[PDB]
């Protein structure tokens, strides 16, 4: 424990409270697709995984099925593929160690057309090979490269413990880009069936970078509780920025909240003349925040109890 | 044309002079390896390409051979593979139009273990498969992802021609990350044989983002002449930053000079306690600037007059 | 009451016997899927419906789950989607009254993208939006149009009491087309996964009209006991044909039986060269008859005494 | 060409002669409202369509303006809305290929609230969402479902060419129901402002079935020349009935003529006690036949010049 890291429940809750109204977050209404859960169950059934891998897989799939809420106006292919790749990613940012060295040569075996060192890796590679079901060419390439980046980032995510982060460096953002896997979902925000890349890609591409900034910086705002205060992840993006800039993690959370603010501002600017484009990501962002809050089984935001400052729905002298 | 986009030869030379003196650029002594050029000629013969693709390949190989200079202290594997991927990437950034719809389905075809839509893409993918010859797993993966990004970025480079950059956006850096291909050479800076990822990856990785910034931004400083003043590229990083921030192109050029300045400062900061790594990338950056100056064929820096540093040993 | 309309249990049982012997109806074996019932239970659980509609939905779900047997060769998506739309349609054909007037402005709110005046209609519209899970584009269009027809027909089903159906007209078939909802189940016999429209639309489309005639007429035949003999529905297709053609109800029943006979024959003719398509609707029709019989909850066929046939009877 | 399909001009003229005298058709007096054509021109100006989609729109609107004659005693809302939907329907029935695959996902996008794949499709969706200007709830639902049927029918219509209407089947009527789009005009025969559904629907709904029969079959009779004799369409309803029953198209024309005869007689029967409705649909039928004759730019019914006997005129 070091004082330049820890943030109290009251302070973290206050940062969340300001962050929500800074972007005017209203919790979106519940979303229930009856097809997603049995479809993903059938998917897990079809895979040639070992036991304790499917047993854990169902446990993680209960979380994964909520990703379909992120794309309410998208076709079934978009939502189900997003849920499937969400399940595959959750199996990694949780259980990447149960495969050992298998992930280190995923990039080599993927380009060489060879079966992977682990079965789950072959499942992931086959999803990368079928990305064209719901995406365009550029989107498929980005999903492949973002999966490569995510696998290698999670492999080397923990290598910088003992405050390896030297000091003056831009490296926390580089590491967070590698570990984020944000671009995969950023491209599914504008699916190729609703918005074909042919016309709409030049419209939504200038907004993609702030979209991925928003995506990455929110598993760093909303999961900062689950991994740093409640856990021990001292290598997450907030802790890296703190270890390199000297600032406390509390200050870094305020910085990141204001960052998501500014990114949202410029997102509204870019997609303003294209109301349906903007509406798609406006649905996506609220569903993202919602799924982060509701999934207490992974992010534990319910345990954050602090003081209130009752507004009494009034302000009288 | 528009006067807002034009930077005179005087101005561009002044920017090059102050850029070189800000980072203390001594023009390095020339690098010669007798093995690189015949090896690359052998490679082009070995490639089952069409004619006029083997011929322009020789024309580009003249430019591509010199990149072994960027990695002096590295094995023949590092320098030769760098030269090979350079010939491939030069061919693409010049003549990606010649392949039609071949490049757009490269990515998926690569992950499915399929033959490519064009033979040149097959050669590129085969380079991606033998990056382990001189790199570790992390480096190989980064090369693969940066190659995918470069192919798609060059394909979608000129889509934004019709003053598409809306206005308030981080997009220019996002596009330059794709078109820049920087991470490949950045990983080649610290080879797996000399500094294996087993002990040195945690040492050099926190310096890759500034190194990629330096690499991306220098072909935007030194190649700004070949593509914007002499040429017509209005969709490069400088033009996009100017098109989105409203600033003049000259302003953004001096901004990027200061950017590479600060990145070099933090590179020296990061790699101070490991002198061998710092020397490796210092060699790389000096040779990179040198290669841009020498290659008047591609960058035309003989037509602009500018200053470097000298220490009363030009007589050597 | 009226003597022209009453059909004795002897008469109705005899008509059922001859109807099943005309089309060679073996009583099908039971179909069990463990997944369908709790899945529909969870579906009802997550609905934003009220109580006394969730409880009524639970009561109807026992009847609704049987529709999965109509598609025994189909994937789970087809079967369960059919079960859910069946649950909604069963809710409506009985308790359409309990939603006031929300059905009258259902179509406008659906096309306008407005949330419905009732939440049950919201669930129904969401099913209309996710028809793509198991159907092509033509099938989805047909399901939407058929749902609109069914809702408006059920809302105007009983507007023609007091023997409104005037004298001489083709109206009964038109109204039974509206209230039949048959096209939704017809397009589910050949789903998009097993027989994509891509190749099979031109093969099974000329067979939908007789299939929908069978579906429409067999509720009228096998529920005529539950709605007219044991009940009071005097505006169903049989009673309308009676009130308009002057023939007795007992006449119209066997007219309809001969009609389904002639439809089944031409269904066999059209689908002869495609044994896969043929077997699918063979299974559908057998299970449809079986569900009508076994659902004594709503059709009460256990009270009449009629005859199928079998030869190897013991089985299991 | 095949002998089973071609009708000689004398034969077709005789068929049309007997058809006209069977239904007692006196060509109605010319109709004109100065408001309509400039209003539709303003509407086409309002549309966000491309050029040559607006250049063709002016050409088709000249055909489409005459539809206001079909509803003389109706308000301007009914007449102008029918004219607008007629213009959209003509545009799609002629140039559905020009929109690519936009129509195939018209229904889903319509119920998901998403914008259409073509601007014209969004214009059509707006008409569907505002059908309540001149109709009741049932009429709006019928128009929406009939438009979905029309779009998918026009898509899949020619998919049954090359003689694949198998052999034994009810399919030609099933396809002509979808391609006909007849219900949209049939409901406008009894508009909601003059005859609200609040009272009159139980009076006129039994007459809708033969009215749609009349619309489909009358167009099939009067357009048979322009599409099968003069043109090339071998997938219209007449050719389909011929290809399934084995009859000649010459035969099927007379079959359909007598069918229209019967439907007209039963229409006169249904609306006998309600003369207000009977006069309205009489107006519609006269105007519909007349408009088929007048619009020689589309149906070319002036070109049927054929020998005929000469009678004598009495009352001397
Ligand atoms: Mg983690
Ligand atoms: Mg991670
Ligand atoms: Mg995290
Ligand atoms: Mg270039
Ligand atoms: Mg480039
Ligand atoms: Mg350049
Ligand atoms: Mg009923
Ligand atoms: Mg009903
Ligand atoms: Mg019934
Ligand atoms: Mg047509
Ligand atoms: Mg036509
Ligand atoms: Mg016609």
mmCIF file of N, CA and C in Angstrom, chain A residues 108-163:
data_model
loop_
_atom_site.group_PDB
_atom_site.id
_atom_site.type_symbol
_atom_site.label_atom_id
_atom_site.label_comp_id
_atom_site.label_asym_id
_atom_site.label_seq_id
_atom_site.Cartn_x
_atom_site.Cartn_y
_atom_site.Cartn_z
ATOM 1 N N UNK A 108 1.700 -15.635 -34.758
ATOM 2 C CA UNK A 108 2.414 -16.408 -35.768
ATOM 3 C C UNK A 108 1.517 -17.479 -36.381
ATOM 4 N N UNK A 109 0.798 -18.225 -35.541
ATOM 5 C CA UNK A 109 -0.033 -19.311 -36.044
ATOM 6 C C UNK A 109 -1.273 -18.806 -36.767
ATOM 7 N N UNK A 110 -1.687 -17.563 -36.517
ATOM 8 C CA UNK A 110 -2.847 -17.019 -37.216
ATOM 9 C C UNK A 110 -2.509 -16.673 -38.661
ATOM 10 N N UNK A 111 -1.345 -16.063 -38.888
ATOM 11 C CA UNK A 111 -0.970 -15.662 -40.239
ATOM 12 C C UNK A 111 -0.462 -16.853 -41.044
ATOM 13 N N UNK A 112 0.103 -17.860 -40.375
ATOM 14 C CA UNK A 112 0.617 -19.040 -41.053
ATOM 15 C C UNK A 112 -0.472 -20.042 -41.413
ATOM 16 N N UNK A 113 -1.704 -19.829 -40.958
ATOM 17 C CA UNK A 113 -2.780 -20.756 -41.258
ATOM 18 C C UNK A 113 -2.678 -22.086 -40.546
ATOM 19 N N UNK A 114 -2.059 -22.115 -39.352
ATOM 20 C CA UNK A 114 -1.906 -23.327 -38.565
ATOM 21 C C UNK A 114 -2.884 -23.339 -37.397
ATOM 22 N N UNK A 115 -3.276 -24.522 -36.926
ATOM 23 C CA UNK A 115 -4.050 -24.589 -35.682
ATOM 24 C C UNK A 115 -3.237 -24.055 -34.514
ATOM 25 N N UNK A 116 -3.936 -23.437 -33.568
ATOM 26 C CA UNK A 116 -3.290 -22.765 -32.454
ATOM 27 C C UNK A 116 -2.774 -23.780 -31.436
ATOM 28 N N UNK A 117 -2.093 -23.270 -30.408
ATOM 29 C CA UNK A 117 -1.577 -24.117 -29.342
ATOM 30 C C UNK A 117 -2.657 -24.482 -28.327
ATOM 31 N N UNK A 118 -3.785 -23.777 -28.338
ATOM 32 C CA UNK A 118 -4.903 -24.011 -27.437
ATOM 33 C C UNK A 118 -6.206 -23.967 -28.225
ATOM 34 N N UNK A 119 -7.255 -24.663 -27.753
ATOM 35 C CA UNK A 119 -8.520 -24.697 -28.507
ATOM 36 C C UNK A 119 -9.247 -23.358 -28.541
ATOM 37 N N UNK A 120 -9.336 -22.717 -27.373
ATOM 38 C CA UNK A 120 -9.968 -21.406 -27.273
ATOM 39 C C UNK A 120 -9.328 -20.406 -28.229
ATOM 40 N N UNK A 121 -8.017 -20.524 -28.440
ATOM 41 C CA UNK A 121 -7.340 -19.661 -29.397
ATOM 42 C C UNK A 121 -7.837 -19.914 -30.816
ATOM 43 N N UNK A 122 -8.086 -21.181 -31.166
ATOM 44 C CA UNK A 122 -8.652 -21.477 -32.480
ATOM 45 C C UNK A 122 -10.055 -20.901 -32.619
ATOM 46 N N UNK A 123 -10.849 -20.949 -31.547
ATOM 47 C CA UNK A 123 -12.167 -20.316 -31.585
ATOM 48 C C UNK A 123 -12.044 -18.821 -31.870
ATOM 49 N N UNK A 124 -11.121 -18.158 -31.171
ATOM 50 C CA UNK A 124 -10.904 -16.727 -31.375
ATOM 51 C C UNK A 124 -10.455 -16.432 -32.805
ATOM 52 N N UNK A 125 -9.517 -17.232 -33.318
ATOM 53 C CA UNK A 125 -9.019 -17.024 -34.673
ATOM 54 C C UNK A 125 -10.122 -17.224 -35.703
ATOM 55 N N UNK A 126 -11.014 -18.189 -35.470
ATOM 56 C CA UNK A 126 -12.110 -18.408 -36.408
ATOM 57 C C UNK A 126 -13.105 -17.253 -36.377
ATOM 58 N N UNK A 127 -13.331 -16.658 -35.201
ATOM 59 C CA UNK A 127 -14.137 -15.439 -35.182
ATOM 60 C C UNK A 127 -13.462 -14.328 -35.982
ATOM 61 N N UNK A 128 -12.137 -14.206 -35.852
ATOM 62 C CA UNK A 128 -11.405 -13.232 -36.662
ATOM 63 C C UNK A 128 -11.547 -13.518 -38.151
ATOM 64 N N UNK A 129 -11.641 -14.793 -38.523
ATOM 65 C CA UNK A 129 -11.834 -15.163 -39.919
ATOM 66 C C UNK A 129 -13.262 -14.938 -40.402
ATOM 67 N N UNK A 130 -14.229 -14.836 -39.494
ATOM 68 C CA UNK A 130 -15.613 -14.592 -39.888
ATOM 69 C C UNK A 130 -16.104 -13.182 -39.566
ATOM 70 N N UNK A 131 -15.210 -12.279 -39.147
ATOM 71 C CA UNK A 131 -15.588 -10.883 -38.906
ATOM 72 C C UNK A 131 -16.379 -10.238 -40.044
ATOM 73 N N UNK A 132 -16.273 -10.745 -41.275
ATOM 74 C CA UNK A 132 -16.975 -10.116 -42.391
ATOM 75 C C UNK A 132 -18.480 -10.351 -42.352
ATOM 76 N N UNK A 133 -18.967 -11.167 -41.414
ATOM 77 C CA UNK A 133 -20.399 -11.427 -41.319
ATOM 78 C C UNK A 133 -21.179 -10.146 -41.049
ATOM 79 N N UNK A 134 -20.617 -9.243 -40.241
ATOM 80 C CA UNK A 134 -21.319 -8.042 -39.810
ATOM 81 C C UNK A 134 -20.515 -6.763 -40.006
ATOM 82 N N UNK A 135 -19.307 -6.845 -40.559
ATOM 83 C CA UNK A 135 -18.430 -5.695 -40.706
ATOM 84 C C UNK A 135 -17.988 -5.558 -42.157
ATOM 85 N N UNK A 136 -17.351 -4.427 -42.454
ATOM 86 C CA UNK A 136 -16.752 -4.202 -43.748
ATOM 87 C C UNK A 136 -15.319 -4.694 -43.790
ATOM 88 N N UNK A 137 -14.598 -4.372 -44.867
ATOM 89 C CA UNK A 137 -13.193 -4.794 -44.968
ATOM 90 C C UNK A 137 -12.295 -4.114 -43.942
ATOM 91 N N UNK A 138 -12.408 -2.786 -43.855
ATOM 92 C CA UNK A 138 -11.629 -2.032 -42.879
ATOM 93 C C UNK A 138 -11.939 -2.495 -41.460
ATOM 94 N N UNK A 139 -13.219 -2.718 -41.158
ATOM 95 C CA UNK A 139 -13.586 -3.203 -39.838
ATOM 96 C C UNK A 139 -13.019 -4.578 -39.533
ATOM 97 N N UNK A 140 -13.044 -5.482 -40.516
ATOM 98 C CA UNK A 140 -12.481 -6.813 -40.306
ATOM 99 C C UNK A 140 -10.986 -6.733 -40.023
ATOM 100 N N UNK A 141 -10.266 -5.920 -40.804
ATOM 101 C CA UNK A 141 -8.836 -5.751 -40.568
ATOM 102 C C UNK A 141 -8.576 -5.184 -39.179
ATOM 103 N N UNK A 142 -9.374 -4.196 -38.771
ATOM 104 C CA UNK A 142 -9.181 -3.590 -37.458
ATOM 105 C C UNK A 142 -9.473 -4.575 -36.336
ATOM 106 N N UNK A 143 -10.491 -5.425 -36.492
ATOM 107 C CA UNK A 143 -10.760 -6.422 -35.458
ATOM 108 C C UNK A 143 -9.605 -7.405 -35.354
ATOM 109 N N UNK A 144 -9.069 -7.846 -36.494
ATOM 110 C CA UNK A 144 -7.938 -8.774 -36.457
ATOM 111 C C UNK A 144 -6.751 -8.144 -35.731
ATOM 112 N N UNK A 145 -6.390 -6.919 -36.122
ATOM 113 C CA UNK A 145 -5.221 -6.281 -35.525
ATOM 114 C C UNK A 145 -5.459 -5.908 -34.063
ATOM 115 N N UNK A 146 -6.693 -5.548 -33.701
ATOM 116 C CA UNK A 146 -7.001 -5.219 -32.316
ATOM 117 C C UNK A 146 -6.989 -6.464 -31.441
ATOM 118 N N UNK A 147 -7.420 -7.606 -31.980
ATOM 119 C CA UNK A 147 -7.298 -8.856 -31.238
ATOM 120 C C UNK A 147 -5.835 -9.232 -31.033
ATOM 121 N N UNK A 148 -5.006 -9.052 -32.064
ATOM 122 C CA UNK A 148 -3.571 -9.277 -31.898
ATOM 123 C C UNK A 148 -3.010 -8.387 -30.793
ATOM 124 N N UNK A 149 -3.353 -7.097 -30.842
ATOM 125 C CA UNK A 149 -2.884 -6.152 -29.837
ATOM 126 C C UNK A 149 -3.372 -6.536 -28.449
ATOM 127 N N UNK A 150 -4.632 -6.962 -28.331
ATOM 128 C CA UNK A 150 -5.178 -7.330 -27.029
ATOM 129 C C UNK A 150 -4.486 -8.558 -26.458
ATOM 130 N N UNK A 151 -4.261 -9.579 -27.289
ATOM 131 C CA UNK A 151 -3.592 -10.785 -26.812
ATOM 132 C C UNK A 151 -2.190 -10.448 -26.319
ATOM 133 N N UNK A 152 -1.413 -9.734 -27.141
ATOM 134 C CA UNK A 152 -0.053 -9.402 -26.725
ATOM 135 C C UNK A 152 -0.033 -8.435 -25.548
ATOM 136 N N UNK A 153 -0.995 -7.514 -25.478
ATOM 137 C CA UNK A 153 -1.043 -6.590 -24.362
ATOM 138 C C UNK A 153 -1.351 -7.281 -23.054
ATOM 139 N N UNK A 154 -2.321 -8.199 -23.060
ATOM 140 C CA UNK A 154 -2.619 -8.952 -21.850
ATOM 141 C C UNK A 154 -1.459 -9.862 -21.467
ATOM 142 N N UNK A 155 -0.721 -10.381 -22.454
ATOM 143 C CA UNK A 155 0.471 -11.163 -22.135
ATOM 144 C C UNK A 155 1.518 -10.317 -21.415
ATOM 145 N N UNK A 156 1.707 -9.071 -21.849
ATOM 146 C CA UNK A 156 2.741 -8.199 -21.300
ATOM 147 C C UNK A 156 2.159 -7.133 -20.369
ATOM 148 N N UNK A 157 0.854 -7.193 -20.092
ATOM 149 C CA UNK A 157 0.215 -6.204 -19.228
ATOM 150 C C UNK A 157 0.876 -6.160 -17.855
ATOM 151 N N UNK A 158 1.131 -7.328 -17.272
ATOM 152 C CA UNK A 158 1.639 -7.434 -15.911
ATOM 153 C C UNK A 158 3.154 -7.334 -15.822
ATOM 154 N N UNK A 159 3.854 -7.270 -16.954
ATOM 155 C CA UNK A 159 5.310 -7.262 -16.933
ATOM 156 C C UNK A 159 5.890 -5.976 -16.362
ATOM 157 N N UNK A 160 5.073 -4.940 -16.167
ATOM 158 C CA UNK A 160 5.549 -3.634 -15.732
ATOM 159 C C UNK A 160 5.217 -3.348 -14.270
ATOM 160 N N UNK A 161 5.039 -4.415 -13.491
ATOM 161 C CA UNK A 161 4.739 -4.249 -12.047
ATOM 162 C C UNK A 161 5.964 -3.675 -11.328
ATOM 163 N N UNK A 162 5.968 -3.725 -9.999
ATOM 164 C CA UNK A 162 7.089 -3.090 -9.259
ATOM 165 C C UNK A 162 7.329 -1.716 -9.893
ATOM 166 N N UNK A 163 6.250 -0.991 -10.200
ATOM 167 C CA UNK A 163 6.362 0.365 -10.786
ATOM 168 C C UNK A 163 7.434 0.405 -11.876
#
